[PDB]
Design a protein around this nucleic acid. Structure first.
Lengths: 612, 633
DNA sequence: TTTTTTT
């Protein structure tokens, strides 16, 4: 109480010591007011550095760690008082005034012993602030709580309100509230619960399994539930790594009660998370300097060539496939017509080659190069599974591998080894960009395919489609078809041997020669940032000249009697337009160049009629 | 324990404004007060419920602003606490209730007779809800915003509790209608006096002890007896609305939300159609034992106020506009799949299937289906799937399905108590089958059970009346002229006979055709509209389909004799055309029946009161074109 | 209980 008031004054002194925290509380308030006027309202939750609270008072920070119930509540009350003073709070709603949202407090960084894992969590950590990191598991479905059962006695004119408190929700132990709406008012008039005026905050309690790598062999990883409220609820899902700054709390009788005759059970322990932080372990980050560098790269005479050469630089002989992969990484432009017709924003590429041709290695490199990618092997891949997945769970629908990363590209090894029925399920993804089972899952993902000749060795006498296991319709569904296979030449063999020897001769900076590990090309993260920036800032659109080029290319492909990897089609014309948009996206041009459309049609010609 | 907090709202003045609005508001812009007219209808018992429009409240507030009087912001206070404002609205309706211009038939109302008798014996004697025979409702505010803007289940928040809000999503299920005792009336013989108890909770404890002052004066401990004729009862139904698939985030399952529908609003919904329902989001109290474990955590629900599902003189005017545009059959055919270029004959057959033929039932008991079934057989890349999806979108109740995606039994009726399958969802609609060639013959048998006779047999049975459409690729993925047309169809003769018509389309290279198709496709790509005739709107097209179906043309003597001659000619043409390359299947008396249904559909599209020989010849010409498309090669 | 389907 009085110590709580001293802690409130000390936390206000901490907010005074760090003007950024008070400015952030006032910024949440001002953004809430501006967004309420514009319409998107920021929750009243504040996260501060644990080292910042330590700088304001090491005693206060260690005291919050030792008695979170005693300190964090008063500190959050001080933050809420500062937020109430700073906020204009114009035209507050009666429901908002009833809500009286507290300003939450969280500690960031420099946790040390407070940093913890569920297996390393201890009874001493109970009733003490801590930070726990582990793979999320068995997350509870969001369930609304009740801050207070606001009521209104009939005809009284006064709205009697009954607050409710939960021991998991409140770090301090409390006598349980009735949690029952009063039947009659204290005045004696009949009491009716006031919906709306009553405040309900979403509450979720998610177990967090210890990381499986952190789990000891011969032992199951420990899991500790972390309480979540308001924005913290549904912050993470099972199977996703997360780190939560939450106070472990002893709870329950733990066999001390008379009812538990055996007394074998221990006191229930449930962490109460002040905040939830999802953790990648990804997504590229773009800065202004990198954006200026990307603008210069687009200004380069061959921006697409530079990006493609940067992609899979160690891989040898697959540079044309890498240019096609850059076009696929752009994906082309996706368009939804007023008629409802859909133009795909993804490009599918297929390359056939004998085992150890490193076409599958280039596909794996493409999976690494993509910020998000789907990996499958045709011998182990089912097309029904790629289009959709079924879980016994009533049964719960699961997204297919193609449906997973529905925007991202999917790289498939041994695509020829994948069955033709699997390829039909994949064709639903390739053309319709959606899959129907009666559940329907969107499948607009790009499908880069690593394949092998049906004979296992490509034959020039055999047609490329004959060597490929895929049907001609599947080849037409693919935006591009390639034949990159292992071959034996003397000079090329010396070059490839020198390349493998150069990969072996590459020395990790931390490991010297004899020590195990652990023209310009953009660094792979920078090229991923360039592709993300292309998709984010450039939306290439068809010009008259580029459109005429694509149309003439498709017409000449349909007219020419020369053999093609796939039959020419209006779908091939659409693929040519999409590849033109992809080349222009690499160029960061809002309107596709006619030369860019010709270059994309040249990639399509290398895909169909022969190398181009 | 109960800290009172004064708020910028006074329920008394707000209710005074509501009572003023009930008498003052009128549909003069649309033109006594309109609300007063509804109150008079309720007094006559011609109206069993009341719906208060939020847009009407906003318009009344705007009128007050024009007059200069400060609006109490009744429309916004509804969004603030609609549940609390509803009681004030009911009280204002009671205050402004006019006398019944029509007799309420009080003698038939046992409650009314006993109410007069109980008042006489007594000389808030009984609950005002028991006195009221109407249910209040709220119409969503007109767009010009939480109530006006529909929400998804995940989009809804706990702060929205106590607020009127519209929601959008698929209705997962609807609970069976159950009685709800709005007021329970208890009677005790010892006193001879009735004691009423108003139940406003999901569960109630019976009084079980006579509260009558007569029993108190006699000192007798009376055993109260509930009377169904005296106790008020209301129909109670629940609905589960699940988030729309687009509203569902990728990798997330849509969440069904329970919704309470009561009174006249009960039984309004059907699971098949998406519904946009405005309702005051409210907490659902937990039971005692479950609440002890839940703690502050609380269940939630929605009480629907206005229900609207996505899918006369105006319809007649629209159909007349289409007729004045003229050539209605070909116009609707070209309107089908305007983005798709060509296949006008297939579109015309699809329009004939949409209109459907007359269903005939003989007096002896024979029933001949009037629903039309069509099949499309085409080479890859001919927009078979695109046209099927467009037709499914054109059909308000039609269902699109794939041969590999769904089992035949699951489409007919999926076993989990029975639940409607894709065909049952296609009731009064068109079940579409993509890649119908890929579908197994075992499931084709289940389809054949329903195509010939609409009913489904499993025991459980459903009428399952629908029109069937199929899209199939030719054997080996593409048509082979060396293969017979029947071989390329690769279908049972029972399926061919049950189908009214099957269309065969071939992919043949052509310079002019490629140029025209590329021009149309490039026009569609550069501009969402097709280059060129203007397709009719889908709503007007469905209205014209319904207007055609209403015609129900009958055959005449000349048309029947001509159809008989055509049947003889077709049987002889099958007998002579046993050559498989030219044989499309033997002549069917049932096929002439299908021909009769197609002629009825054509006369319906022409809105002829009777079937025409021109319609019969047009159906025969549709079949002839189905053969001639392959004959052209 | 009865499909559904993964072992």
């Amino acid at each position: 109480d009085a110590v709580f008031g001293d802690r409130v004054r000390r936390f206000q002194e901490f907010l005074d010591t760090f003007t950024s925290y008070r400015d952030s509380v006032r910024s949440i308030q001002v953004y809430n007011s501006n967004n309420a006027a514009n319409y998107n309202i920021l929750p009243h939750r504040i996260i501060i550095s644990l080292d910042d609270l330590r700088e304001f008072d090491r005693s206060f920070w260690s005291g919050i760690l030792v008695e979170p119930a005693y300190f964090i509540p008063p500190a959050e009350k001080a933050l809420t008082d500062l937020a109430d003073s700073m906020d204009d709070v114009p035209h507050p709603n009666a429901s908002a005034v009833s809500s009286r949202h507290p300003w939450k407090l969280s500690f960031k960084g420099s946790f040390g012993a407070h940093a913890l894992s569920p297996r390393t969590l201890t009874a001493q950590h109970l009733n003490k602030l801590v930070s726990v990191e582990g793979i999320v598991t068995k997350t509870s479905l969001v369930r609304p709580k009740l801050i207070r059962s606001v009521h209104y006695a009939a005809k009284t004119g006064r709205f009697h309100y009954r607050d409710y408190t939960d021991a998991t929700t409140t770090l301090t132990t409390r006598i349980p509230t009735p949690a029952i709406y009063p039947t009659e008012d204290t005045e004696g008039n009949k009491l009716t619960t006031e919906y709306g005026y009553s405040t309900f905050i979403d509450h979720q309690r998610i177990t967090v399994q210890e990381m499986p790598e952190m789990a000891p062999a011969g032992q199951l990883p420990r899991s500790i539930d972390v309480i979540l409220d308001d924005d913290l609820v549904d912050k993470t899902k099972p199977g996703d790594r997360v780190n939560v700054v939450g106070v472990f709390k002893s709870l329950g009788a733990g066999g001390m009660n008379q009812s538990n005759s055996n007394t074998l059970i221990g006191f229930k322990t449930l962490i109460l998370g002040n905040t939830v932080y999802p953790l990648h372990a990804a997504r590229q980050m773009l800065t202004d300097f990198d954006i200026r560098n990307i603008n210069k790269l687009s200004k380069k005479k061959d921006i697409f060539d530079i990006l493609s050469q940067s992609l899979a630089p160690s891989i040898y002989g697959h540079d044309h496939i890498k240019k096609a992969i850059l076009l696929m990484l752009m994906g082309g432009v996706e368009k939804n017509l007023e008629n409802g017709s859909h133009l795909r924003g993804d490009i599918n590429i297929l390359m056939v080659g004998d085992p150890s041709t490193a076409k599958s290695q280039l596909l794996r490199f493409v999976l690494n190069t993509a910020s998000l990618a789907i990996a499958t092997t045709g011998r182990g891949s089912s097309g029904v599974g790629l289009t959709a997945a079924v879980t016994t769970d009533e049964r719960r629908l699961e997204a297919g591998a193609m449906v997973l990363a529905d925007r991202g590209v999917v790289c498939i090894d041994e695509f020829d080894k994948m069955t033709d029925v699997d390829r039909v399920a994949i064709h639903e993804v390739m053309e319709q960009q959606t899959v129907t089972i009666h559940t329907t899952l969107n499948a607009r993902c790009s499908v880069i395919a690593a394949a092998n000749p049906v004979f296992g060795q490509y034959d020039v006498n055999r047609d490329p489609h004959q060597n490929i296991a895929l049907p001609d319709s599947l080849l037409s569904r693919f935006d591009l078809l390639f034949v990159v296979t292992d071959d034996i030449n003397e000079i090329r063999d010396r070059s490839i041997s020198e390349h493998v020897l150069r990969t072996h001769r590459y020395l990790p900076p931390g490991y010297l020669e004899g020590e195990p590990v652990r023209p310009k090309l953009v660094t792979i993260p920078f090229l991923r940032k360039y592709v993300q920036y292309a998709k984010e800032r450039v939306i290439p659109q068809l010009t008259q000249e580029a459109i005429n080029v694509i149309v003439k290319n498709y017409t000449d492909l349909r007219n020419d009697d020369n053999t093609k990897k796939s039959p020419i089609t209006a779908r091939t014309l659409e693929t040519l337009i999409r590849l033109a948009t992809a080349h222009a996206k690499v160029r960061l041009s809002k309107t596709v160049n006619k030369v860019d459309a010709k270059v994309a049609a040249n990639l399509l010609r290398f895909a169909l009629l022969g190398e181009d | 324990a109960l800290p009172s907090i004064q708020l910028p709202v006074d329920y008394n003045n707000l209710f005074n404004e509501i009572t003023d609005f009930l008498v003052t508001f009128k549909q003069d812009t649309l033109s006594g007060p309109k609300y007063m007219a509804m109150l008079q209808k309720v007094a006559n018992r011609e109206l069993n419920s009341v719906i208060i429009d939020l847009d009407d409240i906003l318009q009344y507030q705007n009128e007050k602003f024009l007059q200069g009087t400060q609006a109490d912001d009744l429309v916004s206070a509804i969004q603030q606490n609609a549940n609390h404002f509803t009681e004030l609205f009911c009280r204002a309706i009671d205050n402004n209730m006019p006398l019944p211009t029509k007799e309420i038939d009080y003698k038939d109302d046992v409650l009314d007779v006993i109410l007069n008798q109980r008042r006489l014996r007594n000389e808030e004697l009984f609950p005002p809800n028991l006195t009221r025979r109407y249910f209040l409702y709220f119409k969503p505010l007109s767009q010009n915003a939480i109530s006006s803007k529909p929400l998804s289940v995940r989009q809804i928040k706990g702060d929205f509790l106590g607020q009127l809000i519209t929601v959008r999503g698929i209705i997962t299920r609807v609970s069976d209608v159950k009685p709800a005792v709005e007021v329970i009336a208890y009677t005790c013989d010892q006193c001879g006096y009735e004691v009423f108890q108003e139940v406003n909770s999901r569960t109630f404890t019976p009084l079980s002890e006579c509260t009558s002052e007569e029993c108190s004066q006699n000192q007798t401990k009376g055993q109260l007896f509930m009377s169904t004729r005296a106790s008020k009862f209301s129909a109670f139904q629940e609905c589960k609305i699940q988030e729309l698939s687009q509203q569902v985030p990728v990798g997330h399952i849509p969440r069904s939300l329970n919704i309470h529908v009561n009174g006249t609003l009960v039984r309004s919904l059907s699971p098949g159609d998406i519904v946009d329902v405005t309702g005051i989001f409210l907490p659902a109290p937990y039971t005692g034992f479950k609440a002890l474990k839940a703690g502050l955590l609380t269940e939630t629900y929605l009480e629907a106020q206005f229900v609207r599902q996505h899918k006369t003189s105006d319809v007649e005017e629209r159909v007349m506009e289409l007729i004045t545009s003229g050539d209605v059959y070909n116009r609707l055919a070209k309107s089908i799949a305007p983005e798709i270029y060509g296949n006008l004959d297939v579109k015309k057959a699809l329009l004939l299937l949409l209109v459907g033929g007359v269903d005939k039932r003989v007096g002896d008991g024979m029933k001949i289906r009037g629903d039309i079934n069509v099949c499309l057989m085409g080479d890859p890349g001919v927009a078979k799937s695109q046209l099927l999806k467009a037709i499914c979108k054109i059909s308000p109740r039609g269902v699109y399905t794939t041969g590999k995606g769904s089992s035949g039994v699951g489409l007919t009726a999926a076993v989990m108590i029975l639940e409607g399958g894709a065909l049952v969802l296609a009731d009064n609609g068109i079940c579409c089958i993509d890649e119908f060639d890929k579908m197994d013959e075992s499931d084709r048998t289940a389809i054949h059970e329903v195509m010939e006779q609409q009913t489904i047999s499993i025991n459980t049975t459903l009428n399952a009346r629908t029109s069937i459409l199929a899209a199939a690729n030719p054997l080996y993925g593409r048509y082979n002229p060396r293969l017979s047309p029947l071989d390329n169809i690769n279908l049972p003769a029972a399926l061919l006979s049950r189908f009214d018509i099957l269309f065969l389309m071939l992919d043949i290279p052509s310079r002019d055709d490629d140029e025209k198709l590329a021009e149309h496709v490039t026009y569609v790509h550069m501009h969402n509209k097709q280059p060129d005739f203007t397709p009719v709107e889908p709503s007007k097209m469905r209205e014209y389909i319904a207007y055609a179906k209403t015609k129900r043309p009958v055959m005449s003597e000349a048309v029947n004799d001509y159809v008989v001659q055509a049947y003889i000619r077709l049987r002889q043409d099958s007998k002579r055309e046993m050559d498989s390359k030219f044989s499309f299947g033997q002549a069917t008396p049932r096929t002439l029946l299908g021909i009769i249904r197609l002629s009825q559909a054509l006369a319906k599209l022409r809105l002829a009161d009777m079937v025409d020989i021109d319609d019969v010849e047009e159906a025969l010409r549709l079949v002839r074109v189905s053969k001639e498309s392959l004959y052209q090669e």
